[PDB]
Here is the input.
Amino acid sequence: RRLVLYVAGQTPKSLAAISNLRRICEENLPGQYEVEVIDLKQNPRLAKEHSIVAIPTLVRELPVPIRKIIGDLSDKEQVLVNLKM
Amino acid sequence: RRLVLYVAGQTPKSLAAISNLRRICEENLPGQYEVEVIDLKQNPRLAKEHSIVAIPTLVRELPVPIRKIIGDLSDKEQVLVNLKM
Amino acid sequence: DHGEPGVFVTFEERPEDIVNNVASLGFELDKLIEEEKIAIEHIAVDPSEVAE
Amino acid sequence: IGDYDLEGLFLRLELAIDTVGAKRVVLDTIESLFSAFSNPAILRAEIRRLF
Here is the structure.
């Protein structure tokens, strides 16, 4: 149960992304998985290592098949459905 | 928390724009940001300095990335969502 | 040649490009603007920060 | 979901440029970039910013 959130800088998109992640994770459901936030600007290399293109990105690696979600996570219901199991 | 509203003359569009700005700012929310209204006709130069094309315009400069809204601000909900944070 | 001031309103190319294009032909747009006989207006609009 | 910027493209390209001290750049098959993402306006703005 691990989730990674790739963002770049104190951007409105990334800030809203992490805030919305907080909201969906807490109000919608319990703490089933642990979140880790990585800001790409300091480590551009990690962007290549994880093959990231469009900010912001939310990637789950718990299941064998990877799954990514691109954007700021504005739609709570869609984010929850994409992250539900 | 600064907002600028560029208009031209006692035009119905600009008057309705400032009136609607008053309405959304007051009834919808508190005074989180301060508004300044500039009429372009007296200073056409300022139009070039701020790179303004279509009247009326509502520009926010508080966040690092600029954001503009073009029109008379007829849709209260859309204006508030565009100016919400 | 006929003493008529000019204005060049460009919607895509920047003033640097506009001047450089004719720099080779022998005209001096830098001098003609430096004297204001031709005024260049780069009227560019970016839709990214535009909501209608 | 929401709006995205091709920020990783810029970060990786900058990293490569600084690594190699590059002065010349080649962009091959930029049509796949459009074919991948769905929103056309975002891609248009992003590569206009890239150029």
User: Anything to note?
Assistant: Chain B has one domain: 1-85. Chain B touches chain C at residues 48, 51, 53, 65-71, 78, 82 (CB under 8 Å). The CA atoms of residues 15 and 72 of chain B lie 8 Å apart.
